[PDB]
Amino acid sequence: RPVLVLSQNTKRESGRKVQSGNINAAKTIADIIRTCLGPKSMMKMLLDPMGGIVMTNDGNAILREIQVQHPAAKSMIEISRTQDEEVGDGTTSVIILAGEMLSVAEHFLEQQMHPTVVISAYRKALDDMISTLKKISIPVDISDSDMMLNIINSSITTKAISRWSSLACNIALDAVKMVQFEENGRKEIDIKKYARVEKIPGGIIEDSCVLRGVMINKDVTHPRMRRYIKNPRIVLLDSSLEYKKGESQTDIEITREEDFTRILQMEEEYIQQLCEDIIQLKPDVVITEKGISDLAQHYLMRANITAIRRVRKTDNNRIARACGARIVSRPEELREDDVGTGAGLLEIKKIGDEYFTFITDCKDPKACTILLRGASKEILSEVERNLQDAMQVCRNVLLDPQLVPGGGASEMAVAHALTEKSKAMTGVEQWPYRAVAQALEVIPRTLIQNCGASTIRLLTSLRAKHTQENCETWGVNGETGTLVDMKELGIWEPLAVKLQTYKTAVETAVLLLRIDDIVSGHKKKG
C-alpha cells in the first residue's frame, strides 16, 4: 500500500546543497577546458559516440562533444553554444569567466548574504563593465586591409592554423569581402549560406585558396559534353527535364492501334519542346536541381550545351549568387535576365579519383567556395573551424568597427576601473561588486598558467602597472610570459566579442545563482 503525494521516482533536493552543487558543477565544467585558452593551448582528442574523432581546442566543440547529467553543466554547455552562435569567438573565455564569477559568488553564499543582493551587485557590475569596455575602445578604418589582416591574425594566433597565418587571413578576408551584399537598402554578409568551405583530403595546406566562384562535386551528364568552356552562359533550373506523371489521376483508355505509339511520340515531343525552349536563350551550361533525361541530354548536346543534374538547392543558390543568374522553374518563361553571364571560366577537372566542377573566374561574385587541401579529414575539420572563427571575427569587425586590447589587458583595465568605482559605494553590496570585478583577472591568470610563467608575480606586476594612468593596453605576452603593451604586440579584438563574453558570463552567474531547489525524475507528461 504505497500511498504517496508525489510520484515514487520524484527526487527533491533543496538548501545550501543545491547552490554548492550547481557552483561546483559550473567550476568543473570550466576546469574541463581551462587549459585550452591562449596562443599556447593544447589539442584535445574527443571520441565521438558514432565512432568519429574530433581533435580541437575550440571551447564550444569540446563542450558540445561532452554529455553531462547535472543540469548546471547543461546550462554551461548552452551558454557556450550561445556564445559561439552570437559572435563565433570567446567560448572558452566566457566559460572560464562564468566559472570564476560563480566561485566568488559561492564565497559570499557561504556567509549569510542572500543571493538577490549578489545578483543585484552582479548586474550593477555588468553595467559598469559595459561602460568601461565602451570607454577603452578604439576605432578602426575598415578600408585598411592591413588592419583587418592584423585583426584576423590576432584572432587566429591561438589556433592550429596559426602556422599559416597570412594565407588563412587572406582567405577569410577575401571570402568575407566578396560575400558582402547590399540589396533594397539592406546590408548582409551571410557567411552561413554562401562562402562555403569545401575540404578535399590530400595535397598540402599551402594550396588552399578561395575561388572567385563556386566549386561542386559534379560531372557532366554525358561524356560528349565539353569539360572546358571559356565564357559560359549558365542557366539554372529546378524542374526535371523528364516526363513526369501529373498531379491528378489520369488513366488513359487505348482502343485504337496507333494511340500507344502516338503517346510515346508525344512524350518525346514534349521533351524536345522543353529542350528547344531552353536552347532558345542560347546558353552554354544548364544546371538542374533534379534529374535530366537522356533524351534531354541528347537534345542539349545537339546545341552544344553542357548539362549538370541533381545539384543541391544550396549549391544552386550559391551558383546563382556567384555567376549572377536567376533560378527558373519553367523553361518556357526563361528570360534574358535569367541567363547567367559573368562567370569567366567553367572547368571540370579530376582531383584525386573524383571529378569536380569549377566555376572559378566570375567577375564581382557574391558567393564563393573555400577549397581546403590538408593531411586528413580531422585536420581539415579543425582548419575549417579556425576559418569559421576568422570569418566570424571579420564580420564582427565589419559590422562594428571598434577594437579592444587583448592579452588580458582589457580584463585588468575593467577590473581596475570597477575597483576604483566601488570605493564610493559604502554599502553592503560593494563586496560582491569588487569580487566580481576582480574575477576578471582569471583571463590573464589563465594565460600565464598556460604559458608557464609565475602566476602570482606576473599578476601583481600587471595590477601595479594598471594602477597607473595610461596603462589600459598593458597585458600579458602569451608566448614569453612577459608584460608588454598591446599597442606594440598588436593583439586587438572586436568590442562586440568582449561585450558578448562579459554579458553572457554575468548573466549565466545570475541565472545559476537564482536556483535553490531541485526536483527531478518526474514524467515528461507531454
Binding site: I119, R123, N184, I327, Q500, E507, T508, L511, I515, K525
Partner: protein, 532 residues
C-alpha cells in the same frame, strides 16, 4: 463485512492524510514567494531542464498522486487562467486554511460550522477589501501601471531589470488597446507575440512597433526588404492544381493530355498573376508554396512566406487592415482579387537575430500591434523571461481593466486578519472560532515573505499587526493601512508610498478560490480506494 475490493480510510486518518498532502504541496512552492524568493530547476528525467518561479508551471510539471493535492494543483492552474498572478499565494492560503480547519475539526468542532465560518469570513474579507483597501488608479496615472508591473516582475529573473521591463510591458499593453461595444476599453493580451532568442543581454530585448514573424522567405531569390509593403494574406496553398476525389481524368483522344497537364499549373499561374496585378508586395499564406509560384514571386520582386501560423496571420491581417482570403471567388461566380483586400505597412524586413533570421512587419497602418523579442543567455533563461513577462502583461491588463489596486507586501493580509479577528466576536459561537482561524490563516503570506528573507518573521509580523490594529482602532490614523513589509531591510513600510501594488482582482479571486478548495477538501471524512 463490506467485501469491497479496495482500501478504506475513515475519520481522523483520512482528514490528516488530506492535510498532509495539501501541506506538502504548499511546502513544495513556499520557498518561491516574494522578491527574496528563489527559483527552482526541474528535470524531466530525459535531460529536459526547466528553471522557473511560477507556481502554476511548477505544479503542472510535477506528477502528483494524491487527489487532494491534485485539487490544489488544478486550483493553481485555475488561478493562472482566470487572473494570471498570485498562483503561489492561492495555494499557500488554501493549504493554511485546510490546516487550521483540520485543527478545529480535531478539536471536535463540526466541519459544517467551520465551512459556514469560512464562507462568512471570505464574504466579509472581500467586502472589507472592496470598501477600505482599494486605491483608484485614475489619480496615479502611468506610474501606477509601472509600479504594478515592477511589483509583478519582482521575484522573477527580470527583477532588477524591472526599470526597463516595466516600460516595455506597459508600452506593449497600451499598443494593443482597443474599445469594444459599450465603450469599454478591453486590452487583448496574448496578442503580443513573444519571440525568444539567446544572445545579447536582457537590456537588448527589443519591443517591435509592429509584428514579428518567426518565419523567413521561401526563396533566396526574393528581396529581403520591401519599403512600402502591400501585404496580401491568404489561407490556401499555392501549388499545382489537383482534382478532388470526385473528379477523375480519363483520356481517350491522346491529343488532350498536354493541354490537361499544362492547365494543371496554368490555373495556379493565373491565380498568382491575379494576386500580383494589384500591386501586392508581401504575400503571406498559411499553406505551402511550391517552387513554381516561388519563382513567380521571385520574378516580380515580391515577398512570399509559406506555412505562416494561423494566429500570426490573423493578427497581421487585423493590424495591417488586410482580409484573410481562404479562396478567390466573388459573388459573381468569377475568380478575382482586388486591391481593397491588401493590407499596408511602413516596412517589411527579414532581420538577423543570433545566426537566425525572422521577418519584421514594422508600423502597420490602420491599427497598431506589438511584439517582444527577448534576448537571453540560453534557452532556459529565455523561457523564464517569457513566463515572467506574461505574468507582468496579465497584471497590467488587470490594472487597466479594473482601476482598483491594493497595497502589496502582505499589508492586505494583515489588515484582513485584524478586521476578521475583531469581526468574529459578533457572529455565532463556533463559526466565531472558524472566522478567527480564517483570520489567523491569512497571516501565512507575510510570515512566508519574512522567512524567505531570513528575517525575524515573528517580530516583523507583530509590528505589522500592531500598525494595522492602530489603524483600525484609531479613526484619525487610517493612513497605516498601506503599511506593508519592506523585505530589503526587514522593516514595516508604507507600500502605497513605496509603490508596491497588486490588482484587487488578484486578492479577491485568490481568496474565493482558496475558500472553495478548502471547503471541498474539508467535506471529506471517508475515502474508498478501489484496487485497479
Amino acid at each position: 463485512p463490506l467485501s469491497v475490493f479496495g482500501d478504506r480510510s475513515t475519520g481522523e486518518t483520512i482528514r490528516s492524510q488530506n492535510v498532509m498532502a495539501a501541506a506538502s504541496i504548499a511546502n513544495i512552492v513556499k520557498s518561491s514567494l516574494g522578491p527574496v524568493g528563489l527559483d527552482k530547476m526541474l528535470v524531466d528525467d530525459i535531460g529536459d531542464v526547466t528553471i522557473t518561479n511560477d507556481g502554476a508551471t511548477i505544479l503542472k510539471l510535477l506528477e502528483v498522486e494524491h487527489p487532494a493535492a491534485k485539487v490544489l494543483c488544478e486550483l493553481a492552474d485555475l488561478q493562472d487562467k482566470e487572473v494570471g498572478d498570485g498562483t503561489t499565494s492561492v495555494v499557500i492560503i488554501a493549504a493554511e486554511l485546510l490546516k487550521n480547519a483540520d485543527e478545529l475539526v480535531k478539536q471536535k468542532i463540526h466541519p459544517t460550522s467551520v465551512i459556514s465560518g469560512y464562507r462568512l469570513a471570505c464574504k466579509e474579507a472581500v467586502r472589507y477589501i472592496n470598501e477600505n483597501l482599494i486605491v483608484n488608479t485614475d489619480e496615479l496615472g502611468r506610474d501606477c501601471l509601472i509600479n504594478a508591473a515592477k511589483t509583478s516582475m519582482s521575484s522573477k529573473i527580470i527583477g532588477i531589470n524591472g526599470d526597463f521591463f516595466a516600460n516595455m510591458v506597459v508600452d506593449a499593453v497600451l499598443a494593443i488597446k482597443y474599445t469594444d461595444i459599450r465603450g469599454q476599453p478591453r486590452y487583448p493580451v496574448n496578442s503580443v507575440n513573444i519571440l525568444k532568442a539567446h544572445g545579447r543581454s536582457q537590456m537588448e530585448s527589443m519591443l517591435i512597433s509592429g509584428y514579428a514573424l518567426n518565419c523567413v522567405v521561401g526563396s533566396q531569390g526574393m528581396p529581403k526588404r520591401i519599403v512600402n509593403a502591400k501585404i496580401a494574406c491568404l489561407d490556401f496553398s499555392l501549388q499545382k492544381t489537383k482534382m478532388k476525389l470526385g473528379v477523375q481524368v480519363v483520356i481517350t483522344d491522346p491529343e488532350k493530355l498536354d493541354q490537361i497537364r499544362q492547365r494543371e499549373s496554368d490555373i495556379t499561374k493565373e491565380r498568382i498573376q491575379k494576386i500580383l496585378a494589384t500591386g501586392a508586395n508581401v504575400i503571406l499564406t498559411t499553406g505551402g508554396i511550391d517552387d513554381m509560384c516561388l519563382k513567380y514571386f521571385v520574378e516580380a520582386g515580391a515577398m512570399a512566406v509559406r506555412r505562416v501560423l494561423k494566429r500570426d496571420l490573423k493578427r497581421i491581417a487585423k493590424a495591417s487592415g488586410a482580409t484573410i482570403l481562404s479562396t478567390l471567388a466573388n459573388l459573381e461566380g468569377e475568380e478575382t482579387f482586388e486591391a481593397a483586400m491588401l493590407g499596408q505597412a511602413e516596412e517589411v524586413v527579414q532581420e538577423r537575430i543570433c545566426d537566425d533570421e525572422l521577418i519584421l512587419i514594422k508600423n502597420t497602418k490602420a491599427r497598431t500591434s506589438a511584439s517582444i523579442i527577448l534576448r537571453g543567455a540560453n534557452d532556459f533563461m529565455c523561457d523564464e523571461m517569457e513566463r515572467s513577462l506574461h505574468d507582468a502583461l496579465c497584471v497590467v491588463k488587470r490594472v487597466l481593466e479594473s482601476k482598483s489596486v491594493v497595497p502589496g507586501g502582505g499589508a492586505v493580509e494583515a489588515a484582513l486578519s485584524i478586521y476578521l479577528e475583531n469581526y468574529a466576536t459578533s457572529m455565532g459561537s463556533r463559526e466565531q472560532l472558524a472566522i478567527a482561524e480564517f483570520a489567523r490563516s491569512l497571516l501565512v503570506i507575510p510570515n512566508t515573505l519574512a522567512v524567505n528573507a531570513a528575517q525575524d518573521s515573528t517580530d516583523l509580523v507583530a509590528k505589522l499587526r500592531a500598525f494595522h490594529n492602530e489603524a483600525q482602532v484609531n479613526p484619525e490614523r487610517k493612513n497605516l493601512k498601506w503599511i506593508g513589509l519592506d523585505l530589503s531591510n526587514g522593516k514595516p513600510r508604507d507600500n502605497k508610498q513605496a509603490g508596491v501594488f497588486e490588482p484587487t482582482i488578484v486578492k479577491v479571486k485568490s481568496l474565493k478560490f482558496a475558500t472553495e478548495a478548502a471547503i471541498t477538501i474539508l467535506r471529506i471524512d471517508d475515502l474508498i480506494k478501489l484496487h485497479p
